[PDB]
RNA sequence: UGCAUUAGCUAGUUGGUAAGGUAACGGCUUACCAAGGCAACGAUGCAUAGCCGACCUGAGAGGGUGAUCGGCCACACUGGAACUGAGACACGGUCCAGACUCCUACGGGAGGCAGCAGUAGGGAAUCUUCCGCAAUGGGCGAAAGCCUGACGGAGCAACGCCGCGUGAGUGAUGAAGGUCUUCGGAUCGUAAAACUCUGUUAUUAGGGAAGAACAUAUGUGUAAGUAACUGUGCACAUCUUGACGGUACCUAAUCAGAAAGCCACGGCUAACUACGUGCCAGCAGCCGCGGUAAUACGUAGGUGGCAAGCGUUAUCCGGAAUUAUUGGGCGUAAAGCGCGCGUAGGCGGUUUUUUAAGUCUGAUGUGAAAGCCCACGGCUCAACCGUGGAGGGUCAUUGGAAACUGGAAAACUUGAGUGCAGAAGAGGAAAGUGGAAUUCCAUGUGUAGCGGUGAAAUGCGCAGAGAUAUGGAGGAACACCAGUGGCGAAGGCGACUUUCUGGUCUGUAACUGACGCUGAUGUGCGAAAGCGUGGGGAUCAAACAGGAUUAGAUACCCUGGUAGUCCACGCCGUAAACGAUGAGUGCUAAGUGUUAGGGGGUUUCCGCCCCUUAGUGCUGCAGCUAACGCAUUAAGCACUCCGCCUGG
RNA sequence: UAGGAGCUAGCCGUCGAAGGUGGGACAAAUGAUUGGGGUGAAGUCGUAACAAGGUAGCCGUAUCGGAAGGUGCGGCUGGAU
């Protein structure tokens, strides 16, 4: 159900930030935590705290929100399943919403990121529409 | 509806019903064929006018027309105008329209085609005809 | 090719080896190969087909677009054999069938519109049995020629327009002008006569003219020059040339000259109120009006929106994304499944890691017209034409490499699969708990209406109908356990001792590694009305009887009673089976008392307090739709599938 | 004599549009034929249902009905009393 934490856990989190619940948990991962690490570095939240267990353990979350009790989590989504993924390459990739959007990241040629490849001509990957 | 198991049928819009069988009909008389080629030139024959013993309350005293053009095929149409020579054996042409205070009737018969009368009672709507087109 | 209210398709078949023959190559036929091969990739078969651009155009997405118009196939009286031109089944080739045509003097001969016009014809539409090769064109031909019905032209045209079109306002507002009068002079009006300003288009009459040049046409002679001047190219240059032009350009000849209609005068239709107009005629678009006060029917001087102007007809779209990845939902509304149970699948949770195959190719040769950027020329503006760059910045061509993947090596675990109490079990069934009045009363009787009933008669009434019990039996048929409870695929599931306690079920869950929902498979039934045997008229029960309301039955009424009712052998695929609301991962402030199963404290005297979930209900946050109203358990929220329908 | 093999003159099997035969399929007229709806005052029936439509009852459902209507058995609220 959690291809993305924004898939099913957001059912909890979208209210949890309405009620200022600024810390939560997540399945253990390295790319999933990486993208949230990008977002917390951008300053969405405080920080991606780390895993307690090894295999699908609880990565801690620590969700800061807007000082005005605002939330710019404008939807993030994916379709991963054995049967649905990208057997397919960002040797070129464009952007949407004039660079405000920043979201999921997955490929294989040479390490940059979604927003860290906006200028490369070997781009990244964007899903969300932030503004 | 899904997308990946939607490959067996796309998620799309819908289709058309029947509309005006006479506007776009033809006829091939070679081998009892029945054709269609989308022309306003399709004909009939001048038969009838009347009604029958009511059940519903629609009040109107105006001319009915089972009345049509050269080659016979039975329809239900309208004869516009009061002065008319449409009793039997007439040929005409037809266009569309409905003037108010007329129940449900929705076509016409053009004036002065082969075998009909002309328009008399309207003198302020004067300068029509648009093609042989002076002032 | 598209299409199952077109499905099981096919048989030297499934197209190598040997013989054969295509410039090439074969089951193309033959000695061998398997019944194979083809499959709801809807093969088979039906329908259809010359194909692209073409246009219009939805916000972009990008697309439907063939008439023309361009390109690319096939056919040229149909057909069949052969010949053939290198190739032909030949737009104007033989034999022909065929078919008709004509001829016939009969003896036999053939013809032969799909070149392009018009012929009969038609139409809304195709000109005109149009011009000539003038030019250009090409096939054969030095030279030269023709075909031209190629080519270009001549007419046709709001099919659709276009510039000019309608030029001058000054002095009496009244020199003259009248929809609507209990008229005031304003008045369609310094408009108006007569023209301030004038001489374009307007017709015009010819000087006429360009265009009218291209193509050779002449040896003077050059190049090829062959042994060399030469025939052709041609420096000469003899000056041609219209399918068009004594017309254009021009004098200005010309004069305020030779050139403008719509629904209405209806709210929305802005076009004024009126009369014959009294829902009549009839104008009549959303909708009207009209009935003695029509604005409106009819009519009108103006009169309105734009002018070669006026309204429609078939197509697409604006309208209206009211047609939805982009840009629809499905309770009611356009739509959400008695149902659930199921294989492929769609999607089921992943945590690491390698490739460069795709995830705005690098940069360029690089790009279809009415259609990728600008420059253009002509267009009376236009009407419409074309031209170059940009050739793109759009394909090809070169690239290899994240934090997904296809591929490659590991494991993990929520969506999957292995203890437990077995509580309730009505899941759905397996043995017991082992039988009466109502049917006669034989013991015994005692009576007229029991009755059917609104009230009554019928049925029942004399063994004396209904009667009595030790006694004399059974015909259809075995209500505890009582709240907002437990189960099945459902219809549904009810006596209990029991069953499997299957399964729910919560406390433990002892554990390998995605092992599931919906969905090809397939799963079963679904209640009754009715449903294929004894019962069954025993009860109930239609029908009948027989009764009658108050001023009405045979009906509300029904015993006798027609079946039927009903159980020991066959079910349908229907109910308000309704959740009008399909079934997986999880929440939506949450609360709520509680069945189950647990942790328990306190143990109570089996109870008070806390955590608890499948639910149980109750409300209640968000959300929800128009509101009905739904909601921690949808009529919400983010990841699964299903089907429905976007007019009915 | 080509007589041998040969092809035309002669004999053994082939398809051919063609040609005409045959039973189905579709039609179209329609038959002194013939079923569904609508339609035009509904004269036919009460306002039958909507005010418990005059009696809340309903849904599958024997049932007859020129037409609004009715009686049988399983699930139901879509109800004033």
Using DSSP bridges, classify how beta strands A25-27 and A58-60 pair: parallel, antiparallel or unpaired: antiparallel
CA angle B92/B37/B87 to nearest 5° reads 15
Distance CA B93, CA B106 (A): 15
Q: Bridge partners of B26?
A: B35
Experimental technique of record: cryo-EM
Distance CA A72, CA A66 (A): 8
Q: Bridge partners of B65?
A: B77
Resolution (A): 3.6
Distance CA B2, CA A32 (A): 26
- Strand D: positions under 7 A of a protein C-beta atom: 27-28, 38-44
Three-state secondary structure call for residue B96: strand
Distance CA A13, CA A59 (A): 15
- Strand C: positions under 7 A of a protein C-beta atom: 123-125, 158-160, 165, 259-266, 281-290, 297-300, 307-314, 323-325, 328-330, 345-362, 399-406, 411-415, 514-515, 584-590, 636-648
Q: Bridge partners of B96?
A: B107
Q: Is A13 left (phi over 0), alpha (psi -120 to 50) or beta?
A: alpha
Residue (of A56, A34, A26) closest to A103 by Cα position: A34
C-alpha B62: how far from its chain's center? 17
Residue (of A59, A122, A58) closest to A93 by Cα position: A122
Tokens matching residue A82: 């054995």
Largest CA distance in chain A: 42
Distance CA A95, CA A124 (A): 8
Q: Bridge partners of A27?
A: A58
Distance CA A59, CA A28 (A): 5
Helices (H), ranges, A10-124: 10-16, 32-42
Helices (H), ranges, A48-119: none
Say whether the CB atom of A74 is under 7 angstroms from strand C. Answer: no
């Amino acid at each position: 159900t959690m291809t993305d934490p924004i898939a099913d856990m957001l059912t909890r989190v979208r209210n949890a930030n309405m009620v200022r619940h600024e810390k939560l948990e997540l399945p253990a991962s390295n790319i999933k935590k990486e993208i949230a690490e990008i977002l917390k570095s951008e300053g969405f939240i405080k920080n991606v705290e780390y895993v307690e267990d090894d295999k699908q353990g609880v990565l801690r979350l620590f969700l800061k929100y807007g000082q005005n009790d605002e939330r710019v989590i404008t939807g993030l989504k994916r379709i991963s399943k054995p049967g649905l993924r990208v057997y397919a390459k960002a040797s070129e990739m464009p952007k949407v919403l004039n660079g405000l959007g920043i979201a999921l990241v997955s490929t294989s040629e040479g390490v940059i990121t979604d927003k860290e490849a906006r200028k490369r001509n070997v781009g990244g990957e964007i899903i969300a529409y932030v503004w | 509806p899904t997308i990946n198991q939607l490959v067996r049928k796309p998620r799309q819009s819908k289709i058309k019903k029947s509309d005006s069988p006479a506007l776009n009909k033809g006829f091939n008389s070679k081998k009892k064929k029945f054709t269609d080629l989308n022309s306003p030139q399709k004909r009939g024959v001048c038969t009838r006018v009347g009604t029958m013993t009511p059940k519903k309350p629609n009040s109107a005293l105006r001319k009915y027309a089972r009345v049509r053009l050269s080659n016979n095929i039975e329809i239900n149409a309208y004869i516009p105008g009061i002065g008319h020579n449409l009793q039997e054996h007439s040929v005409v042409l037809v266009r569309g329209g409905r003037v108010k205070d007329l129940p449900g009737v929705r076509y016409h018969i053009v004036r002065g085609a082969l075998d009909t009368s002309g328009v008399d009672g309207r003198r302020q709507g004067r300068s029509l005809y648009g093609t042989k087109k002076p002032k």
